[PDB]
């Protein structure tokens, strides 16, 4: 047939430089930063808990819930119990925030609380201050907006107006109320906030709140839960999460798991590779996921990312919302979250726990070594499944914050960074997503690593990020991230594909950012480039030429180290290269070489005229692309030596005459763009 002649013919002038326009890409208003970096400085643990003295409201049961930060207060005699509970409650907050002043107040007077709150203001001064208020000892807070504390003699419950409390506490603050009708405290706080603004024109924005119960409801009295239920969720999630697991009908299908076993789960909440740490690590991933798939982006940032302690509280608050539901409570929050109790990622936790403590009698009796959870593996699998088909802009992948959690270990880091590449792949939108979920500082920290398997995968990510967000050049130079990439570009054995990206990364770092130009210079980048300049991969020659191109833009020191390495000499080979793009880059670089000088005598002038003479034999060049860049290079030369071209121009109405002749052939050009811009430069002389 007459089809084989057809398919086997070169289609001339049908490529990216021809069909697409030679333009930049209009980069978006990239709003992924948290420049609002809050820090919780100090903590009040006001803790009204007059032990063995049940207030007149709640007549308590015989087997009631008598636990209170994992202590029976009645077993110890009153004063020991109260001191101890302050110690435990402090220890529980120390997990989530170990660098804060913890000033605990135990059965406090009104005046005591005033001293305390105002003192913590003057310490923290602009930054966020926790105010935990327990209130099991005192009667339930009133419709008046008064919460109860004591008098000096312990006879009378004195009231304490919420208006007074938010006077003493500052505006950047956060309240945790664990007392029976705590919704009433939330409401009244928001009312007395409005009252301030209305009276001011003759707080609330900055105040966060967390409250155990709605204004109607009473907290549970159920013998096997602790009385501290909302606090315990908020600040010992895994401990009640496991105990609450054990109380369900779910345990029907995990036989040989009693509460005694859960007392002795081996491990800790930091060592990831031990059953307790594992569950903790999972938990974190899950709650962070439920937040990221439910809340609107702005709000998610405000709570779950801004500062540690608040983020830890809201993560754990999701667990409280799920538990306390099953005992007719509903917790309340000042930035009001949506209902997350039904969200399907909880049934993942349920299974994850199930596996991870059906495996527990075999551990704790025999001494069977701990087998890790399939959770993170399977969860990465789902993310992989989504990447296959889902290049779409449909519902984004549910597992995205779980991928972030997996980067934090060895175990699954290689698999995750590949999948993160294969995601950041898909476009600029996907990079916008992963920067929102907060991938950036964790990826940036992996540059400080030296595991040789990461070198292709980080390079690959950093490429894709710095395409989208050029302003990240700030961050990479601060941490000596540049040195990581300098070493990848120095390696002859890393494949050409990735060395290309590395060169590109170094171009972005160096691009008109003076400190980045300084750093990469003194990391010997000129020597590294010129070794790789004459490769068999045309992207690499292009980009490595652009590096040299950017590094000596308006930066005279780079020109000096260039002349000592004969950089300009070596770059002349790329001027007669078989790809236009390589020639463009070569021309670009030899131009921006010329562009800076600070008026130097022999060598600068002699070299410049040699460069110009070599660029002057690119008039007979096919691609107008090269000729545009060629006019730009000459424009840089024109901008320095204006006195000479003024004389040479005003004559006609050796060297400089030839450059002017070139600019005429470029002005009188068949392609429009070239003729336009050549005429602009020649009009600047005119």
């Amino acid at each position: 047939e007459a089809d084989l002649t057809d398919w086997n013919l070169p289609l001339a002038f049908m490529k990216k430089r021809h069909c697409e326009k030679i333009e930049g890409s209009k980069s978006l208003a990239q709003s992924w930063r948290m420049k609002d970096r809050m820090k919780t400085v100090s903590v009040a643990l006001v803790l009204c808990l007059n032990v063995g003295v049940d207030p007149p409201d709640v007549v308590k049961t015989t087997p009631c819930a008598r636990l209170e930060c994992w202590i029976d207060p009645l077993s110890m005699g009153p004063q020991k119990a109260l001191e101890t509970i302050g110690a435990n409650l402090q220890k529980q907050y120390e997990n989530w925030q170990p660098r804060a002043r913890y000033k605990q107040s135990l059965d406090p007077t009104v005046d005591e609380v005033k001293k305390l709150c105002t003192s913590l203001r003057r310490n923290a001064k602009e930054e966020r201050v926790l105010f935990h208020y327990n209130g099991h000892g005192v009667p339930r807070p009133t419709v008046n907006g008064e919460v109860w504390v004591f008098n000096k003699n312990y006879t009378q419950y004195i009231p304490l107006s919420i208006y007074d409390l938010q006077t003493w506490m500052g505006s950047p603050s956060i309240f945790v109320y664990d007392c029976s009708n705590a919704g009433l405290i939330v409401k009244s706080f928001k009312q007395f906030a409005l009252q301030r603004e209305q009276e001011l024109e003759v707080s609330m924005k900055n105040c966060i709140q967390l409250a155990a119960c709605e204004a109607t409801e009473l907290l549970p009295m159920i013998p096997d839960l602790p009385a501290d239920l909302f606090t315990s969720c908020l600040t010992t999630p895994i401990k009640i999460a496991l105990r609450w697991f054990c109380m369900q009908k779910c345990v029907s299908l995990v036989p040989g798991v009693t509460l005694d076993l859960i007392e002795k789960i081996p491990g800790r909440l930091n060592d990831r590779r031990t059953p307790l740490g594992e569950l903790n690590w999972i938990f974190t991933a899950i709650t962070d996921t439920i937040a990221w798939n439910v809340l609107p982006r702005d709000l998610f940032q405000k709570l779950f990312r801004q500062d540690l302690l608040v983020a830890s509280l809201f993560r754990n608050f999701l667990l409280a919302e799920r538990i306390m539901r099953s005992y007719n409570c509903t917790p309340v929050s000042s930035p009001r979250l949506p209902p997350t109790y039904m969200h399907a990622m909880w049934q993942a936790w349920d299974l994850a726990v199930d596996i991870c403590l059906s495996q527990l009698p075999t551990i704790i009796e025999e001494g069977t070594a701990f087998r890790h959870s399939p959770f993170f593996a399977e969860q990465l699998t789902a993310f992989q499944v989504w990447l296959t088909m889902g290049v779409e802009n449909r519902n984004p992948p549910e597992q995205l914050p779980i991928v972030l959690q997996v980067l934090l270990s060895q175990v699954h880091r290689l698999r995750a960074l590949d999948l993160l590449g294969r995601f950041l792949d898909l476009g600029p939108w996907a990079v916008s997503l992963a920067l929102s979920v907060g991938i950036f500082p964790y990826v940036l920290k992996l540059l400080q690593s030296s595991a040789r398997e990461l070198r292709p995968l980080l390079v690959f990510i950093w490429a894709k990020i710095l395409a989208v967000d050029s302003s990240c050049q700030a961050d990479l130079v601060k941490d000596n991230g540049h040195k990581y990439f300098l070493s990848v570009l120095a390696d002859p054995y890393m494949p050409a594909e990735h060395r290309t990206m590395t060169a590109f990364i170094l171009a972005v770092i160096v691009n008109s950012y003076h400190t980045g130009q300084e750093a990469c210079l003194q990391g010997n980048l000129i020597a590294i480039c010129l070794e790789q300049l004459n490769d068999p991969h045309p992207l690499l020659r292009q980009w490595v030429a652009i590096c040299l191109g950017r590094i000596w833009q308006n930066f005279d020191s780079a020109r000096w180290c260039g002349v000592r390495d004969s950089a300009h000499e070596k770059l002349y080979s790329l001027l007669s290269d078989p790809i236009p793009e390589v020639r463009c880059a070569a021309v670009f670089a030899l131009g921006t070489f010329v562009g800076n000088s600070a008026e130097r005598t022999d060598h600068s002038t002699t070299i410049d005229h040699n460069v110009a003479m070599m660029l002057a034999q690119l008039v007979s060049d096919g691609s107008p692309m090269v000729r545009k860049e060629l006019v730009v290079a000459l424009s840089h030369l024109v901008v320095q030596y204006e006195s000479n071209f003024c004389t040479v121009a005003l004559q006609f109405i050796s060297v400089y005459t030839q450059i002017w002749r070139v600019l005429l052939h470029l002005a009188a050009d068949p392609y429009p763009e070239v003729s336009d811009v050549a005429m602009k430069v020649l009009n600047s002389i005119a």
Binding site: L404, L407, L408, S409, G438, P441, Y442, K445
Partner: peptide, 8 residues
């Protein structure tokens, strides 16, 4: 001072 703990 990153939010989660990175064990490099």
């Amino acid at each position: 001072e990153s939010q989660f703990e990175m064990d490099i």
